[PDB]
Design a protein around this nucleic acid. Structure first.
Lengths: 93, 80, 91, 77, 80, 77, 93, 91
DNA sequence: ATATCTGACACGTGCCTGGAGACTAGGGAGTAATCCCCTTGGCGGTTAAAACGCGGGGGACAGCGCGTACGTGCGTTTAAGCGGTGCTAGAGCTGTCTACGACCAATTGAGCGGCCTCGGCACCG
DNA sequence: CGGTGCCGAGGCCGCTCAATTGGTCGTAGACAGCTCTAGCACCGCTTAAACGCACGTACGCGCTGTCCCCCGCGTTTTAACCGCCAAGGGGATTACTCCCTAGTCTCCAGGCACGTGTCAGATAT
């Protein structure tokens, strides 16, 4: 078992492009890229936690990191989506 | 109000002289202003993110140094 | 008993993310579950945008399959996306 | 010492932080170091600019030189 | 034996054409050889260090990709 | 596809690894990806070279262009 | 207690330049630089250990990392010094 | 009972190094003591070379004190040392 | 124009191990309280840097004059992707056992914090 | 015509918590020992692609020369810096709940690795 997100890519793409197919090599490249950005996020948030002389990671800090790595309009909408999802999790069942 | 104008022509002249080039024509003081504006934009966005992430409301040197490390332009002396 | 990702109604598997992050804790990292949520939603949204751009490059190319050159010209079209991917593209 | 008058730099730094969050304050030493660093960075940029201009067999500088430089290093801004 | 010579002139011509420039004079096939030699030197030193560190005796793709990540020229598709 | 004949590249890659350790072997796919990457890198170098040459108001390329480029990016080799 | 190497810099400098003084700011900058390269070494060796799908760090891997970060003649002499010190430790009391 | 650094006759404090490395284990890093030894000797040697170059720039400058411009022109003299320090120098 | 043809792409299906709580549970971290250090306001000199004008003057800057360094274009090798063929040896994998790191005592002493006189420049007096 | 004292140095001592082992103890990786499939040789080969020669041509160097765009330099002038001054409010720091990771277990169900029809490039009638 060596994990992939291909299936979830498929699902969200169906959520936006229900009618589009995707070649396998393209899906694998997408998976490699998303893993890269993911580990970027991870390492950066770790740096952050260290940099406040703390030990624990919280959504606020993933937020910090993504704000750091993302430009402008994309940054704004990303922060918005993250906060909205955090709420729809917490202030919910 | 003319904030970017603060960068004087003689300032950039003495700079280019310390920078190794001697004949700086004229049509760049504007352009220097622009490039410095962009660079400052990036670094200062990174700095202010670092700051407020600490739930604080002033900027510290460690913040800017972190920022410059992020751009691959690390500087020495303060926190590494 | 609902899957946390299913709970918040998000498509990326929050547990797997939580694990992968647990792989880089530096011996004391505690994973605020909500941090996993935030990360998952971030990936989901940004990848949705990436796929939107690539799918437009395929529909305007009149192809229902995806190619490396599609995403190539895709990122070669947008500034921010080019910024995020500093890497050299395969093909 | 350094080559830029401090108070103009303060005005500018405050404006630029301003568009990001109001009434933020700054360790004076931090703006000092920032001025130092950006000045050095612009110095380096001028150095490479002069290199390229010499390559252009002309000794004066023109914004084409700056544009080319910042396109070559990779800042692409 | 003329190993670096293997880079043909028409190869570099078709390259520069795929590279966007059309009139490639002549005195660079040598120079292309030199720069490619240096770049390969660096990347391959890094690759072979990665390899032998695994106590192994052949080079794998993951090795080169690690190498390119080290130089800040990461490529996609194989191990990230 | 790619623009360099593979077997010449194999000869060269083996020579260059040779000066570092004898009788070493190579995942063929690895040399494939290496060729891909270095070719792309040289392509980028040519692109910036052409940029600079256009700045030099001349359309042909001369090793001064390559030298200047590799001095500007920072490889300083 | 926020650690520094200034004292050890002093000692080794005496070992090579017994007659030379050093300003404080220079010593602090040296300390900052050495900490930077140190953490570089550390993070890189960690990457390495991960990259062989292992967990533990050993001198062989610090060796790998320094070889990676150091050019040519310096790399050779550094590897030599490291191996010699490792021996003078192990095959000794 | 000898200090490990004193034992191998090396000047950098191997225990402190061991600790600093323990600060970045990723929850499972075990510090091969000899790895600490190797690292300490590496730092020692490379810094010896750096200081040799800077001290030559001071003696040829006829000054018994050390300055930022000393090391500035020092690294501006050697290729490898410039390579190792990609950073911009303060002053 | 279009069936087709192949792979290669979406459905359908047992067979896992990674997720969903329970609750400890212990602890990192929010949070209240202080406090006092640095960062703004803010006022005038000031003088030393910055426009402004004004010579002035120089280098650039595309305008000409100019053939052999660089695309075609066969024309001619010729080496190189193909095609197996081997092949084996290094690389994948697994018991095991064993050397090797965490731990708390001792402990201490080598490593943080004052201070000090040693010396340097340096004109102001 | 002057020789000299804040500021960093290296002892130098006083306080004190990171090495230092010792087994323990548990275990990650050497490490022996397998059973395999991809890098070399190891051949000749079609072709395309690399020289090569010849053609054949034009562009990166002279010239055009000047003139206005930039540099030096007074000439105001005006704002950066000082100097002070304050103050207060926000890092900073500390002591106190507490919620909030995680561990184990359950436990099971969605992923995973199969298969499988069907039709998008692809070809010719």
């Amino acid at each position: 078992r060596k994990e992939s997100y291909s299936i979830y890519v498929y699902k969200v793409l169906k959520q936006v492009h229900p009618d589009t197919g995707i070649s396998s090599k393209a899906m694998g490249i997408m998976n490699s890229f998303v893993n890269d950005i993911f580990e970027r996020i991870a390492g950066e948030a770790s740096r952050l936690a260290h940099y406040n002389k703390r030990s624990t990671i919280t959504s606020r800090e993933i937020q910090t990191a993504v704000r750091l790595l993302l430009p402008g309009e994309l940054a704004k909408h990303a922060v918005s989506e993250g906060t909205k999802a955090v709420t729809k999790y917490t202030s919910s069942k | 109000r003319d904030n970017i104008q603060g960068i004087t022509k003689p300032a950039i002249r003495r700079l280019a002289r310390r920078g190794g080039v001697k004949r700086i024509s004229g049509l760049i003081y504007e352009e220097t202003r622009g490039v410095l504006k962009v660079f400052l934009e990036n670094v200062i966005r990174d700095a202010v993110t670092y700051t407020e992430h600490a739930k604080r409301k002033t900027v510290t040197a460690m913040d800017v140094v972190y920022a410059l490390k992020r751009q691959g332009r690390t500087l020495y002396g303060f926190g590494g | 008993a609902v899957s946390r990702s299913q709970r918040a109604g998000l498509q990326f598997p929050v547990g797997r993310i939580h694990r992968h992050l647990k792989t880089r804790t530096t011996s004391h990292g505690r994973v605020g579950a909500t941090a996993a949520v935030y990360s998952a939603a971030i990936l989901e949204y940004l990848t949705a945008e990436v796929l939107e751009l690539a799918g437009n490059a395929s529909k305007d190319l009149k192809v229902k399959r995806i190619t490396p050159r599609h995403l190539q010209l895709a990122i070669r079209g947008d500034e921010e996306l080019d910024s995020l991917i500093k890497a050299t593209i395969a093909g | 010492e350094l080559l830029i008058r401090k108070l103009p730099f303060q005005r500018l730094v405050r404006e630029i932080a301003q568009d990001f969050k109001t009434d933020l304050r700054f360790q004076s030493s931090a703006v000092m170091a920032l001025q130092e660093a950006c000045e050095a960075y612009l110095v380096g940029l001028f150095e490479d600019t002069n290199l390229c201009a010499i390559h252009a067999k002309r000794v004066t500088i023109m914004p084409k030189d700056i544009q080319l430089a910042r396109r070559i290093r990779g800042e692409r801004a």
